[PDB]
RNA sequence: GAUUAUCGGAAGCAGUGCCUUCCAUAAUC
């Protein structure tokens, strides 16, 4: 079967059917030292080794990471599953449908056509009910394709964790969960042992057609984490520390793997945050190997104990269960950067500028100094004798002593950083501790809570903290006269204590001449203390309403406590609710899709019209026309654009043909299901620079005519007349964001070959995928260098026993001949070429 | 003008949010 079969063994001898490839018996001297991520890549490559899509030397390369990491070599990564967000999967599902159709047309069980891996269509208005119904049809019709519908009261990330597997138990195997997504938050799951990241519809679709993600074997930076943090330090402090640090270290385009005792101190939430912020510091992924915390957490989500213990069982079996408290398991990372948690210092910001940072234990000092100095960001010249002023006042029939640098406003609000919930919970437990200690927040202080929407809801509801928060006046959501007076009259510098990184300048009160940003717990604490002028280490927070003294340390809750509660109640409640919702949402046959011609969004593609089940030998492109003559860096959006449709476009006209108004046009993206619209929108980008026109215009010159018209129509009459079409380009052709149709389009137009000096990786692969020929000039040649005008008829001589990366001959109607590099880089791509599309190849492969 | 939108683009980091600002593109009023 597969050359590494000798490595597969029952995970449990009783169940000889359920097997696993034991990498320990592959070369423990090297394997035992690999990073766990590389271990995942390895496992997947090994397990999927088939002498074609994944060859032996690939396994050898991955395995020989410690050396191959430095040779910048491309290995295959074959993920366990795939995530398609919202309607990004439409093109895919459509493709597979059309495939089933073709296979039926050629006589063969269509129910063979299926995504190689599990596929999840996740969703967050009557416009798209059609598409939804379509995707649902997909979920019904396809094997291992689940759909999560809208109306699920549950939050995307939470959903992704819900769809987490960690260890696949399936097809009689045990393997590590790994994925790729047309999704924003994908990488977050790497906070939980699952390895994966974001890609484009085309890559995802390849992974769905079992084509492995070709990828340069990444270096791995080891982030070692040790030491205990100072109690006032919070998840946000830590996460931010790590993120900035990593931003400094320059891990761009490599893997970041975490290790060291300290990792134990990072909750899955923390790890997930840290992991999802990775595209900041550019890391391709940030791996947090599966451990005891991960397992416990997995139990806490309400997973099946048995399958959890199973997961652990296989992880230890295959050697991918982590013991951070055991340096003698540590991989030999490319580089090691460290972090001592007693380095992170709790810092507030102010008193006039967010960027003006200040330690928690230098508050009294820094403030008194700011009183010292004169008008400025870190000063408010108050006569050095007024420095101890203090005016009294009356609030609802009671007297208080408002003094310099007292706190008038105390506002806790969300922080965009996804480590908010834990910190909020922290504030909560602090409040609670303070209520227990019998402390209060003096009535006059303008106190407020605004945690925002999302997961924090669970962190607040399920810990039962809201009461304690509200008791200190911190309920969920113009200050007192006596305060205004006492302030202005007393000539006091008033302090506003805030929590939240959003719009600081836009919520500085006028009566307050000083404003500080802090962590919510710290907010509550300062609001309790009354005045920021205080060192919590010497001066107590307050005297009980029963005598004894209480300091901040006494009520401040430890990360251990916070995590404890989070784990015991929050996670359970949350996921209970998630299961309930999932359940009550699903309640809201035909194995071939019936297309509605009255449709505008979903149509069957041409692709496999006349698709024979016999091979189609190398077809020599004889005397073809240069459709487009483009410059350097023609982008994906240039090739197949996004955004709304203009009224002067072939798209808008084909739409106009069908009683459609510019209002009910929608965007090119929402028409990704229509080869018509998409093919008509190809190269229809206003900013398109065609050298045939020396101006920015989505048009070309139909040589036999001299008429300059829209590319779709030009190519239309071209292909009607039956003219082979090629495209000329320059450097980094195809660069840019993901555009599903950047190949399908040019394919449908009639482009048989593109010719450039320099291609973009993904794009070339995609072209080869659709079966378009990618041609590359020789080193030091190009359009002008060879004097090509684009006005010639082109003959591309294609040999019979064509081999990869080979030089092939281009000759002109003008007798002008020259060599070009045919960019089929492997026998796989030569195959895809000879079949004329990975789709075709898969169809033929399944119809047998 | 406002508003809304995009398989849009660029930038920004109290600090990475599918946030904010700007640009393009369109539709609604």
Q: Using the CA of A668, which nucleotide's C1' is the nearest one?
A: B7
Say yes or no: A638 and A692 in one domain: yes
A667: CB within 7 A of chain B nucleic strand: yes
Q: How far is CA A459 from CA A117, A421, A455, A573, in A?
A: 35, 6, 7, 9
Examine residue A636 and state whether it is found in any structural domain, yes or no.
Answer: yes
Spatial distance between the Cα atoms of A446 and A129, rounded to a whole number of angstroms: 48
Examine residue A785 and state whether it is found in any structural domain, yes or no.
Answer: yes
How many helices (H) does chain A have, and how many strands (E)? 30, 36
Return all residues near A667 (Cβ < 8 A) that are at least 6 apart.
A642, A643, A644, A645
Distance of A662 CA from B27 C1′ (whole Å): 7
A500: CB within 7 A of chain B nucleic strand: yes
A674: CB within 7 A of chain B nucleic strand: no
DSSP code at position A684: -
Spatial distance between the Cα atoms of A777 and A784, rounded to a whole number of angstroms: 12
CATH classification of the domain holding A251: 3.30.499.10
Beta bridge partners of A817: A811
Examine residue A417 and state whether it is found in any structural domain, yes or no.
Answer: yes
Distance of A668 CA from B24 C1′ (whole Å): 15
Residue-wise over A648-671: b if at least 16 C-beta within 10 A, else e?
ebbbbebbeeeeeeeeebbebbbb
Beta bridge partners of A359: A347
Question: Hunting for tokens 């994966």 — which residue is that?
Answer: A196
Please report the sign of the dihedral spanned by the C-alpha atoms of residue A114, residue A117, residue A123, residue A127.
Answer: negative
Say yes or no: A659 and A568 in one domain: no
Backbone angles phi, psi at A400, to 5 degrees: -135, 165
Distance of A478 CA from B28 C1′ (whole Å): 37
Q: Using the CA of A353, which nucleotide's C1' is the nearest one?
A: B14
Spatial distance between the Cα atoms of A686 and A681, rounded to a whole number of angstroms: 11
CB atoms near residue A385 (< 10 Å) = 7
Residue A493 is encoded by which pair of tokens? 């510098």
Residue A762 is encoded by which pair of tokens? 């993904």
Q: What is the DSSP string of A128-149?
A: SHHHHHHHHHHHHHSTTEEEE-
Examine residue A772 and state whether it is found in any structural domain, yes or no.
Answer: yes
Runs of H (alpha helix) within A145-234: 156-163, 201-208
Q: Using the CA of A347, which nucleotide's C1' is the nearest one?
A: B14
Distance of A168 CA from B21 C1′ (whole Å): 44
A349 neighbors A236 (Cβ within 8 angstroms): no
Spatial distance between the Cα atoms of A592 and A676, rounded to a whole number of angstroms: 21
Domain final residue, candidates A330, A346, A362: A346
A82 neighbors A180 (Cβ within 8 angstroms): yes
Return all residues near A612 (Cβ < 8 A) that are at least 6 apart.
none
Distance of A74 CA from B25 C1′ (whole Å): 38
A766 neighbors A640 (Cβ within 8 angstroms): no
Expressed in Å, this structure's resolution amounts to 3.0
Examine residue A602 and state whether it is found in any structural domain, yes or no.
Answer: no
Distance of A488 CA from B6 C1′ (whole Å): 51
A417: CB within 7 A of chain B nucleic strand: yes
Nucleotides of B under 7 A from a protein CB: 5-9, 14-19, 24-28
Say yes or no: A582 and A666 in one domain: no
- CA-based nearest residue to A440, from A329, A541, A340, A308: A541
Residue positions counted in chain A: 848
Cα–chain center distance at A122: 14
Residue nearest to nucleotide B26 (CA to C1'): A644
The alpha-carbon radius of gyration of chain A (Å, integer) is 32
- CA-based nearest residue to A740, from A224, A92, A101: A92
Domain final residue, candidates A346, A361, A389: A346
Structure method? X-ray
Query: Into how many domains does chain A fold?
Result: 3
Say yes or no: A577 and A654 in one domain: no
Say yes or no: A715 and A837 in one domain: yes
Pairing mode of beta strands A357-359, A514-517: unpaired
Spatial distance between the Cα atoms of A7 and A15, rounded to a whole number of angstroms: 17
Distance of A604 CA from B4 C1′ (whole Å): 32
Domain final residue, candidates A325, A346, A367: A346
A141: CB within 7 A of chain B nucleic strand: no
In window 72-111 of A, residues with CB < 7 A from nucleic chain B are 85-86, 88
Examine residue A611 and state whether it is found in any structural domain, yes or no.
Answer: no
Examine residue A662 and state whether it is found in any structural domain, yes or no.
Answer: yes
3-state secondary structure of A424: helix
Say yes or no: A336 and A360 in one domain: no
Examine residue A244 and state whether it is found in any structural domain, yes or no.
Answer: yes
Say yes or no: A155 and A201 in one domain: yes
**What string of H, E and C letters represents the secondary structure of A309-373?**
HHHHHHHHHHCCCCCCCCHHHCCCCCEEEEEECCCCCCEEECCCCCCCEEEHHHHHHHHHHHHHC
A273: CB within 7 A of chain B nucleic strand: yes
Pairing mode of beta strands A707-710, A549-550: unpaired
Q: Using the CA of A280, which nucleotide's C1' is the nearest one?
A: B16
Q: For residue A843, what is the enclosing H or E element?
A: helix A838-846
Say yes or no: A119 and A168 in one domain: yes
CB atoms near residue A693 (< 10 Å) = 16
A234: CB within 7 A of chain B nucleic strand: no
Domain that holds residue A759: 619-848
In window 170-189 of A, residues with CB < 7 A from nucleic chain B are 184-185
A476: CB within 7 A of chain B nucleic strand: no
């Amino acid at each position: 079967s597969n050359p590494f079969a000798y490595l597969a063994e029952p995970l449990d001898p009783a169940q000889p059917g359920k097997k696993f490839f034991n990498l320990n018996k592959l070369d423990y001297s090297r394997y035992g030292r690999l990073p766990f991520s590389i271990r995942v890549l390895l496992e997947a490559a090994v397990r999927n080794c088939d002498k074609f899509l994944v060859k032996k030397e690939d396994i050898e390369n991955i395995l020989n990471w410690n050396v191959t990491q430095h040779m910048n070599i491309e290995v295959p990564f074959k993920p366990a599953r795939v995530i398609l967000q919202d309607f990004t999967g439409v093109p895919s599902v459509v493709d597979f449908a059309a495939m089933r159709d073709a296979v039926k047309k050629l006589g063969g069980d269509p129910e063979k056509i299926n995504p190689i891996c599990p596929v999840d269509l996740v969703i967050d208005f009557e416009r798209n009910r059609e598409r939804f119904e379509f995707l649902k049809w997909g979920s019904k019709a396809f094997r291992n394709m689940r759909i999560i519908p809208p109306g699920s009261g549950i939050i995307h990330q939470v959903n992704l964790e819900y769809l987490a597997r960690v260890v696949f138990d399936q097809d009689g195997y045990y393997y590590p969960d790994s994925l790729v997504g047309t999704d924003s938050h994908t990488t977050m799951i790497d906070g939980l042992g699952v390895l994966g990241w974001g890609v484009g519809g085309i890559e995802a679709e390849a992974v769905m057609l079992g084509q492995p993600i070709s990828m340069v074997l990444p270096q791995v930076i080891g982030y070692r984490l040790m030491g205990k943090p100072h109690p006032l330090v919070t998840s946000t402090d830590i996460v931010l520390t790590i993120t900035k640090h990593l931003r400094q270290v320059g891990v761009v385009g490599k893997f970041v793997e975490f290790f060291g005792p300290g990792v134990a101190q990072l909750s899955i939430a923390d790890r997930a945050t840290i992991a999802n912020m990775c595209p900041e510091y550019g890391a391709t992924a940030t791996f947090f190997p599966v451990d005891e915390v991960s397992i416990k957490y997995l139990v806490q989500t309400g997973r099946d104990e048995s399958k959890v213990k199973q997961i652990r069982k296989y992880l230890q079996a295959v050697g991918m269960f982590r013991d951070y408290s055991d340096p003698s398991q540590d991989p030999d990372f490319t580089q090691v950067v460290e972090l001592d948690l007693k380095t992170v210092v709790p810092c507030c910001s102010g008193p006039k500028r967010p960027q003006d940072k200040v330690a928690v234990s230098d508050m009294k000092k820094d403030f008194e100094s700011c009183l010292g100095a004169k008008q400025g960001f870190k000063g408010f010249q108050v006569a050095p004798d007024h420095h101890n002023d203090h005016k009294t006042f009356i609030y609802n029939d009671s007297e208080f002593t408002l003094s310099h640098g007292s706190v008038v406003i105390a506002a806790i609000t969300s922080s965009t950083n996804t480590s908010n919930p834990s910190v909020m919970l922290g504030a909560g437990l602090l409040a609670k501790k303070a209520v227990d200690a019998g402390l209060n927040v003096k009535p006059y202080v303008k106190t407020s809570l605004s945690p925002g929407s999302g997961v924090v809801t669970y962190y607040l509801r399920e810990s039962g903290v809201m009461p304690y928060l509200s008791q200190l006046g911190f309920d969920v959501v113009p200050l007192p006269e006596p305060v205004v007076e006492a302030i202005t009259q007393g000539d006091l510098v008033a302090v506003g204590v805030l929590s939240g990184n959003r719009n600081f300048e836009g919520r500085v009160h006028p009566n307050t001449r000083a404003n500080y940003l802090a962590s919510p717990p710290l907010v509550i604490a300062y609001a309790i203390a009354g005045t920021i002028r205080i060192d919590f280490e010497k001066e107590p927070l307050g005297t009980n309403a029963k005598g004894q003294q209480v300091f901040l340390r006494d009520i401040w809750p430890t990360r251990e406590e916070i995590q404890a509660v989070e784990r015991q109640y929050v996670i359970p409640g949350m996921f209970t609710e998630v299961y309930q919702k999932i359940e009550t949402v699903n309640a809201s046959s035909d194995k071939l899709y019936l297309w509605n011609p009255k449709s505008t969004y979903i149509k069957s593609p041409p692709f496999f019209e006349n698709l024979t089940l016999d091979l189609q030998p190398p077809k020599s492109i004889v005397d073809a026309y240069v459709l487009l003559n483009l410059g350097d860096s023609v982008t994906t959006d240039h090739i197949s654009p996004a955004g709304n449709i203009a009224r002067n476009s072939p798209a808008a006209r084909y739409l106009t043909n069908r009683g459609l108004t510019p209002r009910e046009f929608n965007s090119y993206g929402s028409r990704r299901g229509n080869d018509a619209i998409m093919a008509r929108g190809t190269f229809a980008n206003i900013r398109l620079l065609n050298r045939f026109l020396n101006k920015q215009a989505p048009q070309t010159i139909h040589l036999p005519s001299g008429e300059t018209l829209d590319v779709f129509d030009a190519a239309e009459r071209y292909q009607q007349e039956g003219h082979p079409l090629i495209v000329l380009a320059g450097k980094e052709y195809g660069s840019g964001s993901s555009r599903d149709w950047a190949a399908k389009g040019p394919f449908l137009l009639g482009i048989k070959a593109v010719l450039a000096e320099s291609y973009e990786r993904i794009h070339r692969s995609n072209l080869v995928g659709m079966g378009v020929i990618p041609l590359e000039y020789l080193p030091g040649e190009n359009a002008d260098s060879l004097g090509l005008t684009g006005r010639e008829r082109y003959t591309i001589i294609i040999p019979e026993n064509l081999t990869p990366r080979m030089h092939v001959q281009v000759k002109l109607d003008t007798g002008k001949t020259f060599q070009a590099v045919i960019r089929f880089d492997t026998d796989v791509e030569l195959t895809y070429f000879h079949n004329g599309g990975i789709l075709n190849y898969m169809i033929r492969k399944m119809a047998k």
